[PDB]
Design a binder for this molecule. Sequence first.
Ligand SMILES: Cn1ncnc2c(=O)n(C)c(=O)nc1-2
Ligand SMILES: [Mn+2]
Length: 219
Amino acid sequence: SIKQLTLYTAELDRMLAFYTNMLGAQHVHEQADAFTIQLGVSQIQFRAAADGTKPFYHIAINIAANHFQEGKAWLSGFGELLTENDEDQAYFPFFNAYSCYVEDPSGNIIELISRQQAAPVLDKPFSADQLLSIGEINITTSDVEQAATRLKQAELPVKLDQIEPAGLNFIGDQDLFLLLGPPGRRWLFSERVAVIYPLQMELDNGVSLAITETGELVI
Ligand SMILES: Cn1ncnc2c(=O)n(C)c(=O)nc1-2
Ligand SMILES: [Mn+2]
């Protein structure tokens, strides 16, 4: 799983307010020119973006198998649900998962994903305290093949011969997938096309990786 994720934002103030209101003060901590949010076992640190840039990403958050309708209702309280092909949710047969989406103040595409067999059934009400972990993050890179290769050299599940340098590649299994692909591809549920922005990531198993501002995945 993702222990720590570092992202950039050109809307630090609005983002801090947005997440404080969504998650509650007990999951959101203001720092110096940054703030953190805790999503179950995953933390995201949002740092101030460079001037002249407007970084955004696609982040999916795992929720329990039985929590989708409550999750969707909850998410809708924080912004208009995004739609694709006139639908305000998706079923993804490959993940056997239900998803819903909202845009945050930076234009991040924030998804709740409820994996129907790859997430637990929690017999309790859903709430902001029931977000389990980060289930997806985009790895938008200037070199998909290089990125896929290094991710394998990092001991992640990768089938190199299946990698599509011009398309989106699902890297992972169980409840975490890295969405590896090139810039230019429009994100489902969004008007925004994928753009390379820097980030850093620490997995629970100690592996550390980063995407530079020009799109190079490094370990
Ligand atoms: C292909 N695909 N499968 C599953 N989920 C997505 C998704 O959330 N987004 C945002 C996307 O652009 N493409 C997807
Ligand atoms: Mn997604």
